Ligand binder design. Sequence first.
Ligand SMILES: *[C@@H]1O[C@H](CO)[C@@H](O[C@@H]2O[C@H](CO)[C@@H](O[C@@H]3O[C@H](CO)[C@@H](O)[C@H](O)[C@@H]3O)[C@H](O)[C@H]2NC(C)=O)[C@H](O)[C@H]1NC(C)=O
Ligand SMILES: *[C@@H]1O[C@H](CO)[C@@H](O[C@@H]2O[C@H](CO)[C@@H](O[C@@H]3O[C@H](CO)[C@@H](O)[C@H](O)[C@@H]3O)[C@H](O)[C@H]2NC(C)=O)[C@H](O)[C@H]1NC(C)=O
Ligand SMILES: *[C@@H]1O[C@H](CO)[C@@H](O[C@@H]2O[C@H](CO)[C@@H](O)[C@H](O)[C@H]2NC(C)=O)[C@H](O)[C@H]1NC(C)=O
Ligand SMILES: *[C@@H]1O[C@H](CO)[C@@H](O)[C@H](O)[C@H]1NC(C)=O
Ligand SMILES: *[C@@H]1O[C@H](CO)[C@@H](O)[C@H](O)[C@H]1NC(C)=O
Ligand SMILES: CC1=N[C@@H]2[C@@H](O)[C@H](O)[C@@H](CO)O[C@@H]2S1
Ligand SMILES: CC1=N[C@@H]2[C@@H](O)[C@H](O)[C@@H](CO)O[C@@H]2S1
Ligand SMILES: *[C@H]1O[C@H](CO)[C@@H](O)[C@H](O)[C@@H]1O
Ligand SMILES: *[C@H]1O[C@H](CO)[C@@H](O)[C@H](O)[C@@H]1O
Ligand SMILES: *[C@H]1O[C@H](CO)[C@@H](O)[C@H](O)[C@@H]1O
Ligand SMILES: *[C@H]1O[C@H](CO)[C@@H](O)[C@H](O)[C@@H]1O
Ligand SMILES: *[C@H]1O[C@H](CO)[C@@H](O)[C@H](O)[C@@H]1O
Ligand SMILES: *[C@H]1O[C@H](CO)[C@@H](O)[C@H](O)[C@@H]1O
Ligand SMILES: [Cl-]
Ligand SMILES: [Cl-]
Ligand SMILES: [Cl-]
Ligand SMILES: [Cl-]
Ligand SMILES: [Cl-]
Ligand SMILES: [Cl-]
Ligand SMILES: [Cl-]
Ligand SMILES: [Cl-]
Ligand SMILES: [Cl-]
Ligand SMILES: [Cl-]
Ligand SMILES: [Cl-]
Lengths: 497, 498, 72, 73
Amino acid sequence: SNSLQYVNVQVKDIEADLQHGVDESYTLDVEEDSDTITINAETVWGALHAFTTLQQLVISDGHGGLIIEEPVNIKDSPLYPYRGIMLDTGRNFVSLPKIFEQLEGMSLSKLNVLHWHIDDAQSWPIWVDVYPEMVKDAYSPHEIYSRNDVRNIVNYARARGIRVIPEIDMPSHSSSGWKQVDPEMVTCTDSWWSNDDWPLHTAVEPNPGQLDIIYNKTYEVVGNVYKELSDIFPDHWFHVGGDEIQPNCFNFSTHVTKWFAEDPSRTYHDLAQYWVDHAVPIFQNYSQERRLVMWEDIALSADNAHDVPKNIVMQSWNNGLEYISNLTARGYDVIVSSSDFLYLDCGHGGFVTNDPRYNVMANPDANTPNFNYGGNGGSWCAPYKTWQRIYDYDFTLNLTETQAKHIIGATAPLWGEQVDDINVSSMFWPRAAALAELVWSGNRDANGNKRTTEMTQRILNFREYLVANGVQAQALVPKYCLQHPHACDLYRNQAAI
Amino acid sequence: SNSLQYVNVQVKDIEADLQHGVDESYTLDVEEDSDTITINAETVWGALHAFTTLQQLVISDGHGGLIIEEPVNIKDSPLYPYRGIMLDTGRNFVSLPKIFEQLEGMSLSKLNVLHWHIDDAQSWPIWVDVYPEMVKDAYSPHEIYSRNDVRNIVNYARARGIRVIPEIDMPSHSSSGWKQVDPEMVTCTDSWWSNDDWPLHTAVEPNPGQLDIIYNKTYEVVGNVYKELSDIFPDHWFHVGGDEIQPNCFNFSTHVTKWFAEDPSRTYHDLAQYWVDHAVPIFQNYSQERRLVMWEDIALSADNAHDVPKNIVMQSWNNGLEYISNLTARGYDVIVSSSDFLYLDCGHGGFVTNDPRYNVMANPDANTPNFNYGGNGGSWCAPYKTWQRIYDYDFTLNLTETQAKHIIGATAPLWGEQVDDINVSSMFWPRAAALAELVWSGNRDANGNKRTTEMTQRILNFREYLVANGVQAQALVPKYCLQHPHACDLYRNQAAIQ
Amino acid sequence: VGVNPLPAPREISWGSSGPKSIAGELQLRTDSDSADGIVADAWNRAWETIVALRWVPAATEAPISSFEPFPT
Amino acid sequence: VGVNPLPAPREISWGSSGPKSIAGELQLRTDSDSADGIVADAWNRAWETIVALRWVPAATEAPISSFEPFPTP
Ligand SMILES: *[C@@H]1O[C@H](CO)[C@@H](O[C@@H]2O[C@H](CO)[C@@H](O[C@@H]3O[C@H](CO)[C@@H](O)[C@H](O)[C@@H]3O)[C@H](O)[C@H]2NC(C)=O)[C@H](O)[C@H]1NC(C)=O
Ligand SMILES: *[C@@H]1O[C@H](CO)[C@@H](O[C@@H]2O[C@H](CO)[C@@H](O[C@@H]3O[C@H](CO)[C@@H](O)[C@H](O)[C@@H]3O)[C@H](O)[C@H]2NC(C)=O)[C@H](O)[C@H]1NC(C)=O
Ligand SMILES: *[C@@H]1O[C@H](CO)[C@@H](O[C@@H]2O[C@H](CO)[C@@H](O)[C@H](O)[C@H]2NC(C)=O)[C@H](O)[C@H]1NC(C)=O
Ligand SMILES: *[C@@H]1O[C@H](CO)[C@@H](O)[C@H](O)[C@H]1NC(C)=O
Ligand SMILES: *[C@@H]1O[C@H](CO)[C@@H](O)[C@H](O)[C@H]1NC(C)=O
Ligand SMILES: CC1=N[C@@H]2[C@@H](O)[C@H](O)[C@@H](CO)O[C@@H]2S1
Ligand SMILES: CC1=N[C@@H]2[C@@H](O)[C@H](O)[C@@H](CO)O[C@@H]2S1
Ligand SMILES: *[C@H]1O[C@H](CO)[C@@H](O)[C@H](O)[C@@H]1O
Ligand SMILES: *[C@H]1O[C@H](CO)[C@@H](O)[C@H](O)[C@@H]1O
Ligand SMILES: *[C@H]1O[C@H](CO)[C@@H](O)[C@H](O)[C@@H]1O
Ligand SMILES: *[C@H]1O[C@H](CO)[C@@H](O)[C@H](O)[C@@H]1O
Ligand SMILES: *[C@H]1O[C@H](CO)[C@@H](O)[C@H](O)[C@@H]1O
Ligand SMILES: *[C@H]1O[C@H](CO)[C@@H](O)[C@H](O)[C@@H]1O
Ligand SMILES: [Cl-]
Ligand SMILES: [Cl-]
Ligand SMILES: [Cl-]
Ligand SMILES: [Cl-]
Ligand SMILES: [Cl-]
Ligand SMILES: [Cl-]
Ligand SMILES: [Cl-]
Ligand SMILES: [Cl-]
Ligand SMILES: [Cl-]
Ligand SMILES: [Cl-]
Ligand SMILES: [Cl-]
């Protein structure tokens, strides 16, 4: 039979830049009596996907050579244009080589968005020219992302058709960095986060602090940081945060205390709206093509603002389908990140110290799962999300045809409280690859039935493929299960799912 | 002040061998005017401990030189002689560099036992000369521990005062390896493990298989494999296993069911005894100093053996203090490894595939923790045991003195279903450092108050040390918490824990 | 076949005429690349991985096995 | 004292006479090592770690800070 010599690639539009919605489709054809592997694609980005497909097809003939096992015709494209994971370098620093390693993983699984949660309350690791002093709240001089570092990250991604979407979370999760520019611009940073004394709590987790929404100069400093960062990140999309505004924290701001005093009818909804009316126009005005992303909290929490522009994409992490349905029904575009399915950090207990909740020497109630015995172990989103839990997630279930059109894709976040170089790759992978397939080609076979059981061998093999490509992905099963397909199935009935 | 120049070490007897209960105590002294760090140890092994303490005291002075911050007086020794972790290489193979890496962390934290679970149903990774055919059930030709691999592991451990205590788990957890020798010495290995249809279940975990307890030749091969291995492992202790005996597996053996037919008075308890009274002689036969360890199931499961020699050390993993009380009351030396405090694998969901328990798109009950919402997520021993959980475990609580002195120490097992080289270190470390202190010096301050809050900065720093030393330990908190001490405490009140 | 690319492609169909050897090295041919050589570079990375891995499927699909029944 | 060796040694007592410089290289002195040189070998590994790492304590013990109190007007 006829040997393969060439890979012909025809790309229709060589101009299309790496930006939201760009056509990622391709065809790949290997014919019985052709010496050519034929790849067609609407853009270069579709062509790259073809190559990563293709490398998973060329294998050893076991005699020193290489084969593709059979002729093949493929036609491929993603169900959703937004296929992401989120990296948190605010809680702990992740080095460039480990960031590259993740981008390699994304490449091979065809994820195309790295949502970069750059800072948080706990550190500001990114160099800002206009305020050099912000990196004083970096963990060490060697744990700073220089501008050239960012250039190499953007570029490494670009080369693998991956969009980097920066997030500077505001106005909550704000202490480090900001407070170096102007102490007044953040509030309650010196407060005790006070979950031991719940009615005084200033944050949901240690390191409290929020931007002072009323303090006039806040918007000067954010505008200058945002602008400088917008210039170095080329994606038209920018994530401005909006999660977990804590009302109690503003009690440390004289400025907000006065603002409530001067008109006592005001609520935290108004305060949230004040931020929306002053921050958003600054953000939206960077360029004409700019789209913002925000956490759903701004438009859906208990302290939600009244009117969030339907311009702004909502990232949904709470209450699963209920918040997705709610959001889509109001006309917002939604990135699915539902923490009951897709949060990669759950299941490692709590990180807060001096915690007596662990100190229980016997099961206090065997009749039900409780803190130390079958319950959450200190991790608010427990249990750990397995690859199956992720893959099984039908995030468009019970949505109308119009709601479902507002779903633009998904993002599995990996919050960094207990993540750094050591385990970042084993927490992302290979679970991220399960989401990868979910938002690329779905979790259903040709007949519409859920094919989780079929995914098993594919994801088990891909895990090893990841490891061979330098991506330190976690073992999922005993290797016996790899070598004996379905030997490790709970249900012998292959339609159980 | 005076400048240090020399380390002086006097070992009382240079002859004591690395075996259970050897005197691990030492003293370390630095005086103001003395140019000598003075170390006294009963054995070489105590001196080894002094060195790992000593390196944690000698820090940078900020000007390219080294200092000990103050003079100091240290007297130190282990509360328990058995302080361990258990590596599972049966479920997934772990390479030698990565085994070396665990032994390194073990050394810096003073753990002295590498309990090595070599095989299981899923694989047989260890070379056996008498039966070269056993490793046909290794995951590949590269995933095998040669004879020389074991010698180097043992030596690398010996150099760091660590005893390697092997486990070949019998009579359950037996399929791979065994069945290349004689396919009739294993039963139900081609069964369906059948947890989808619980009454017909042959195993707790897929890849079912157990040793035919009746079959003639079972005990020859077991004896030959055991004797060969016993020779390459210089510790006097050996782990035979004996956990999770599944009664339905034997139904696939003609022998055992024929043996039940012969006399219908015979129950499964009798069947366990049969193994005890045939296997233990074979094991005790090896050596005069040979001691045995086994999992508690043998003498305390639903289908336990009537009479297990009080000579065999019992490793307890179920029901926490309850089962520890039961065994210690009946005269058994006990290794604590309770799953509710010390199982390091827990909290990563289930590994079993085609599993529809995950396929729930909404919380079925918001008031009770359930499978995908608050509950285990398919890890039977969930949740994940944090370093605090581990450190808080008072494993002699509500025991008598006669009971308490039957506790010989503890072992934190890392089961290897979802563990290979990639994460073995971040799963072990730094949490095993919490156990390490618990069984070295305890979790109590001078006044008997539980000092977990004091352990915070110690373990946090120790994690960064381990990383500096090559050991890939997991981060436990945002780095903000190291640099701002107690800023991530839940309670300011440093007496919150008791 | 043994290979099983992830994600599963939207549509993929294999033939049965047997293996096609890669003769020498797959040469890329295109007239339609960006000015920054995105495609050429991606192919170099893809191809150098392919030849360095000489990949062997680690886990392949097959029907669940026939186990011996529980004896009646 | 910054260092916080793990495990917490049974009994440890620190002085106040000030820091003690290491004078270049710490030299081992023993006439009581196992025949196979276990103490010597363990020392060499510890010393080479000490000198390569020049450890700087990464976390240290302190009293808790004075967090600003929740105001009441
Ligand atoms: C932190 O600051 C906020 C804002 O100052 C405090 O809440 C505000 O104060 C009181 C809460 O008791 C509310 O006004 C009162 O309303 C009742 C009738 O509903 C009336 O009888 C009183 O004379 C008074 O006007 C006001 O709604 C509220 N503002 C909010 C929620 O935006 C809050 O108590 C402070 N928290 C702490 C822990 O100090
Ligand atoms: C697997 O094999 C075992 C025996 O090889 C079966 O267990 C046996 O089950 C029978 C009943 O099914 C038990 O006999 C009982 O005897 C007492 C007399 O006092 C009485 O309860 C009944 O008359 C009953 O016939 C027998 O004790 C029991 N043997 C043991 C050792 O526990 C088991 O049923 C088999 N399972 C299968 C085929 O699914
Ligand atoms: C989305 O969820 C919110 C709950 O926050 C719903 O908003 C509430 O709706 C009722 C009716 O207007 C009011 O009583 C509440 O005060 C509303 N919250 C506000 C104004 O912040 C909303 O109905 C949901 N949308 C759905 C189910 O489609
Ligand atoms: C210990 O025993 C006391 C009574 O002596 C009992 O109240 C307590 O619940 C027991 N605690 C545990 C952890 O077993
Ligand atoms: C979807 O709608 C149907 C209506 O009967 C219901 O059975 C199902 O439970 C709904 N939602 C979810 C999350 O299953
Ligand atoms: C958005 C979200 N904001 C919070 C994060 O800052 C935490 O790190 C995370 C931990 O799981 O929980 C919520 S999700
Ligand atoms: C002893 C024990 N025997 C079983 C082990 O084979 C598993 O690895 C473990 C899974 O956590 O569960 C129990 S504990
Ligand atoms: C999948 O198929 C391969 C060959 O392509 C087998 O070797 C393997 O056992 C599995 O069944
Ligand atoms: C599939 O696997 C089962 C279980 O070992 C065997 O019984 C069967 O012959 C096939 O190998
Ligand atoms: C299916 O086929 C296998 C052959 O491997 C049998 O062993 C089994 O009992 C079942 O009939
Ligand atoms: C522990 O002590 C060190 C100095 O040794 C401080 O830098 C640290 O902040 C903490 O107080
Ligand atoms: C300890 O930390 C608190 C909280 O930041 C401060 O208010 C105090 O001054 C010290 O730095
Ligand atoms: C301790 O110090 C803090 C930080 O300056 C004060 O805000 C507090 O009142 C206490 O005196
Ligand atoms: Cl464009
Ligand atoms: Cl398509
Ligand atoms: Cl207003
Ligand atoms: Cl609305
Ligand atoms: Cl709980
Ligand atoms: Cl919680
Ligand atoms: Cl299909
Ligand atoms: Cl001896
Ligand atoms: Cl009998
Ligand atoms: Cl549950
Ligand atoms: Cl379970």
